[PDB]
Structures are given as structure tokens and as C-alpha cells.
Design an enzyme around this catalytic site. Structure first.
Site, short mmCIF file in Angstrom:
data_model
loop_
_atom_site.label_atom_id
_atom_site.label_comp_id
_atom_site.label_asym_id
_atom_site.label_seq_id
_atom_site.Cartn_x
_atom_site.Cartn_y
_atom_site.Cartn_z
N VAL A 73 0.80 -1.60 -0.02
CA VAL A 73 0.46 -0.16 0.02
C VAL A 73 1.08 1.15 0.07
O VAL A 73 0.63 1.99 -0.72
CB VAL A 73 -0.51 -0.29 1.19
CG1 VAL A 73 -0.14 0.13 2.48
CG2 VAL A 73 -2.11 1.31 1.55
N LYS A 74 1.77 1.25 0.95
CA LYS A 74 3.16 2.32 0.68
C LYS A 74 3.14 2.67 -0.90
O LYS A 74 3.74 4.15 -0.68
CB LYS A 74 4.00 2.55 1.36
CG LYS A 74 3.50 1.86 3.52
CD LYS A 74 3.05 2.76 3.51
CE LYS A 74 3.20 2.64 5.28
NZ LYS A 74 2.85 1.45 5.83
#
Ligand SMILES: *Cc1c(COP(=O)(O)O)cnc(C)c1O
Ligand SMILES: N[C@@H](CCS)C(=O)O
Lengths: 317, 317
Positions: A43-44
Site C-alpha cells: 500500500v505504501k
């Protein structure tokens, strides 16, 4: 029928997959948003992209500059990915607790890694947060984008992640469950989704030993990416309807169930968020739907929860 | 937008990304098809799925049966993924050369792994191929899908992978470069694409020490997934316009360049195929395009070429 100009263009638009075995005891249907499909594996990637691209557009940074970021690993990878593509030097400061697989990914992306003592508090002088500040003061033309305070962290989720959720579910979604680290994911999603549908329930998952979801006792744990000993500036706890306190054993056990019973090659905090959802979603009724954010891939934990000897050594098997 | 009913529904439709630094000395434009976006981490998800689903429809296998497969790892993962979702027991036979990460993924998906001696010839009684046959003769309700001879291996690429290439490029594609292991990828793609556009060039990458692309000397090498000491039945060398012989040093060096200069978190055979493409694509002119198949993820090699200590141990750094 489109060709992507570079790997950053594949960030986002991640699949949502129905959970078919683990939610057997729920009234509602249960779904997972699979952030391990991002090109950096987590997700980052979304916030590495957003923080870098916005900073470049605004003139805060320019190619050739150095980006320094304290991280548990994934934000470092997201920034290193953007820096490799766009031409930034990248330095990571990372506590020894974080997995070696993260350091090797970082090195191959061209980042330099400073490992710091595991147990330092956010204000302790030898910590990854403090060391990044010393590095920025000494390295010309460097910047700390700072996922804990940069609005482009939650904004990436308000405009990106949450838009994808709206596009996939519309009003036919009643709960989202997300682990909380910086709080950017849950805050950006909660703000956008509650504007769109004020009845939606937003559930945070927070480890025992973290203060984000309540409590005062600070204690270490093995799950990576969630929980903190301070409230990040980007976290808005007023948008969260409930917190579920999670624990290492149930997180890693549930992560292994996700792999074996759903074929989802996910990470430890995915087990934490899913375990929390299996508790919180009991408030939903027939025909309602719950979505769980799954932040990263098994790749970061091959030598940890994916390894039977590590699990037994740490008391989880 | 789409909600997927299970993880198998996310197999395929993989991104094509332009290569922006490594092809700077070519006249043509250069692109990569990123098979590491498959949920199991490799192109072989496609054939694990196709072989299982077709065999089940034909009555050769049924849920609850045991599937036994000789593999370098990735086909094993694809079958294990399908087996976890659909309810098959999975046993893999795999040479000792293959990475520990592949075995860990297989174990977490619920597969059983038998390791066989690396130096055994394909027809030696102790090879992974021979052991799979011995196990199938003994284990009730067990079946070998057999990626080396099963037409649903190349068929998955003829009907799937190659259709995606047609959809992304149309007639504006002049060369495809692919490493050759079973030959299913290169054969299915070459057959479909040459029907669509007979002028397209198909280039195989084969390690030194394999016989697939010529030669008689058998020699070991560290790159995984490409090259063999026999011709798999699914390989059709008459469809390949040229072979480039690859080597470990250039493969791992080029793989590291893909990670660092393009942000592509790929594996060793991706470096082999890309290194071959950087040679073969010199025949193309301005306005032409070359596509390289990138089969799998860095996850499978974290302890190997992606690790500086391993590279030093093996004499590459
Ligand atoms: C199998 C595989 C290949 C080659 O693909 P085939 O379709 O078997 O020819 C290349 N690289 C890796 C990592 C593979 O697993
Ligand atoms: N969020 C946890 C602790 C409450 S303070 C819970 O609901 O039990």
C-alpha cells in the site's frame, strides 16, 4: 488496452477479492482489498508516489536531491521505487526489528540503509526518526518527506484508495477494517467514504502495546507496520467508529489462514486486520458487506511468520 | 471496476511497461510484460490454473485428488494456488538448486515438497521428474498434470498471454523475447502472434549448459526456471527465429539493473531475457518495438542474487 509509461503508473487500482472460507461464521459477505498487487509490494507505493510527486511539483524537491525517510520498511520501499524511477537519491533509517527482506529490496532499489537499535522511542536520540534528522542536517539538498505529518499520505487514500472502493462497491458497502500505523489509510478512506455514505462503519486494528487505539502502556510486538507510541499528525481518530486491539499470535495465525485457505500471499498485519474484521463484522446483517485492507505481501516476512521455526521460537506455533 | 470471486480470477491481464533506461542504446522502443503481478508471483499461475481447470472439466482429476508436479518452483506455486482455492492436495518435486523462498511459499499454501539432487539428469531415477512418477504410482487418487507435455501449458499462452499482447500492441510490435524452460510461454506466444502477424520475430533466451537453444554440453548454472537437459514435448523450436545463449553473470547483473534503474522487482531469468533482448533488438529500427517477458518476482531470490553475500559467495561480486 494501455501500455504503462513506467512502473509507477501501475500503482493503485488494486483488486478486491471475496473471502470465501474465513468469513463462514459471519452474516455479511467479506472482501479484501489486495494492496500486495502494487509494484513495490505494499500500500505504501501510493504514498511514496504522492509525497514525491507533489513535492516535486511544488518545488520542494528536484531530481538529484536526497530523500531521507524513517520507516518500518514499506514506505522506504515506496519512496525508493519513486526515487529509482524519477531520479532521487534515497536514504532509509530503519529499526533492527524490521525484516531483512525489506533491507535487501531497499538495497536493490538503490537506497542506502542505516539500521538503528530496535527499542528506541520516537524521541530517543538513536532512533530512526532522530537519525534521519541528523542525516538531513548533514547531507546537502536532502529532505524528510515525513509520512507521519505529510497530508499527501492520507490524501493519496482520500483521492485514490477510497475512490477505488467507491467505484467497486458504491453504496453497497457497510464496513471497512484497516490496521492503523501512520493512520493515513484509515483517515483518508474514512474521510472520503463517510462523505459519500455517512452510515459506513470504519474499524481500526491496533496492536496491544500501541496507544493509537487506546491505552497507555507501551510494549513491543512482532507485527510490523501497525501501532505506534505517539499519535501521528495525519491520524484523525475522530473518524474511526471503533478500534479492535490485536495481538501477535492471532495476527500471524490468521495471516497463515489467509494464505492456506484463500491463496492470498499476504503479510503479518494483513492477518491482524482480517482477525479484527472477523470480530467487528459481527455487527453486520445478511446482505451487508465488509471490506478489509490487506497492506502488503508475504515477501517481507519469509524469514518471520512464514517460517515455522521462527513461529515456534516466538510462541506462535 | 470488478470484484473478484477468488484470487484465481486475478491471474493474467498483466501490465506492459516501457523500459526507459536499459534500452537507451537501441533504435527501437523496448517494453516488458510484467508477469510478477500474478497473485502467485509468476507467469506460471496461468498454466497452473489452465491445467487444473481443463483436467477437472475433462474428468481426469476431481477436487480431493492429489496433484503431483515436477517443477523448478513456479509451476508448483501456480498449482498450489489453484489447489488451495479449489480443494486439491498438492505435492511438488523440485531440485535442490531452487530457492528456499519457493519452498516456503509452497509450504504456506499447503503443498508438500520433495527435494531431488540438482545434478541428476532428467531421466536419472532420482530426478524430480522420475520421483513424481514414482509417487504417482503409489499415492491413491494422484495425478501428474505434467507441464512438460500438457498442451494446456502452451494453450494458456496461445489463448491468454498472447491475446493480451495483441490487445496492447496490435500490429505495432516487431519482436518478443522470452526465456525458455518448458517452452510453453514462447511456443504459445509464437504460434498465436505469428498467425496474427507473420513478420514478428520470436527470440528465445537459453542458458549456457542447456540444450534447448543448441549445444550438447550439459552444465549447471544458478539462474532458475530456464534451460533443460531434454526437449520438453510442449516446446516447438520451429517457431523460434533465433536463440541467444545467456550466462549467470550477465543475467544477475541485468536483473539488478532492472530493479535499480527501472524499479522492476523481478527475478533472475528476467535478467537473462532482458540481456538477450538488449542484443537481439539491435536488428530493429526507429519506430519498431520489442517486448520482453518478465516471468517472476524478486521474492523468489531474496536470499540469492538479490543478496550481496550470496553474490560474493558465488563469485559475482
Ligand atoms: C518457467 C519459467 C520460465 C520459462 O517459462 P516456460 O513457459 O516454462 O518456458 C522463465 N523464468 C521463470 C522464473 C520460470 O518459472
Ligand atoms: N479498542 C479496544 C480497546 C478498547 S480501549 C476494544 O474495543 O476492546
Amino acid at each position: 488496452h494501455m501500455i504503462y509509461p513506467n512502473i509507477l503508473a501501475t500503482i493503485g487500482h488494486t483488486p478486491v477479492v471475496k473471502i470465501n472460507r474465513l468469513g463462514k461464521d459471519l452474516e455479511c459477505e467479506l472482501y479484501a482489498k489486495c494492496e500486495f498487487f502494487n509494484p513495490g509490494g505494499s500500500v505504501k507505493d501510493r504514498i511514496g508516489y504522492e509525497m514525491v510527486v507533489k513535492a516535486e511539483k511544488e518545488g520542494r524537491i528536484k531530481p538529484g536531491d536526497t530523500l531521507i525517510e524513517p520507516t518500518s520498511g514499506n514506505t522506504g520501499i515506496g519512496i525508493a521505487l519513486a526515487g529509482a524511477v524519477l531520479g532521487y537519491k534515497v536514504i532509509i533509517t530503519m529499526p533492527e526489528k524490521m525484516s531483512q527482506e525489506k533491507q535487501s529490496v531497499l538495497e536493490r532499489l538503490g537506497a542506502i540503509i542505516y539500521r538503528t537499535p530496535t527499542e528506541a522511542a520516537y524521541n530517543d536520540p538513536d532512533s530512526h526518526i532522530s537519525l534521519a534528522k541528523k542525516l538531513q542536517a548533514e547531507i546537502p539538498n536532502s529532505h524528510i518527506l515525513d509520512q507521519y505529518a505529510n497530508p499527501n499520505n492520507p490524501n493519496a487514500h482520500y483521492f485514490g484508495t477510497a475512490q477505488e472502493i467507491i467505484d467497486d462497491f458504491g453504496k453497497d458497502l457497510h464496513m471497512v477494517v484497516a490496521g492503523v500505523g501512520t493512520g493515513g489509510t484509515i483517515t483518508g478512506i474514512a474521510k472520503r467514504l463517510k462523505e459519500f455514505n455517512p452510515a459506513i462503519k470504519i474499524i481500526g486494528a491496533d496492536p496491544e502495546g500501541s496507544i493509537l487505539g487506546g491505552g497507555t502502556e507501551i510494549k513491543s510486538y512482532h507485527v510490523e507496520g501497525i501501532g505506534y507510541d505517539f499519535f501521528p499528525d495525519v491520524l484523525d481518530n475522530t473518524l474511526i467508529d471503533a478500534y479492535i486491539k490485536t495481538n501477535d499470535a492471532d495476527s500471524f495465525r490468521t495471516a497463515r489462514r489467509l494464505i492456506k485457505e484463500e491463496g492470498l500471499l499476504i503479510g503479518g498485519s494483513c492477518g491482524a486486520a482480517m482477525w479484527a474484521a472477523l470480530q467487528a463484522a459481527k455487527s453486520l446483517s445478511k446482505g451487508q458487506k465488509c471490506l478489509v485492507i490487506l497492506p502488503d505481501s508475504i515477501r517481507n516476512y519469509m524469514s518471520k511468520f512464514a517460517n515455522d521455526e521462527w513461529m515456534k521460537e516466538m510462541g506462535f506455533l
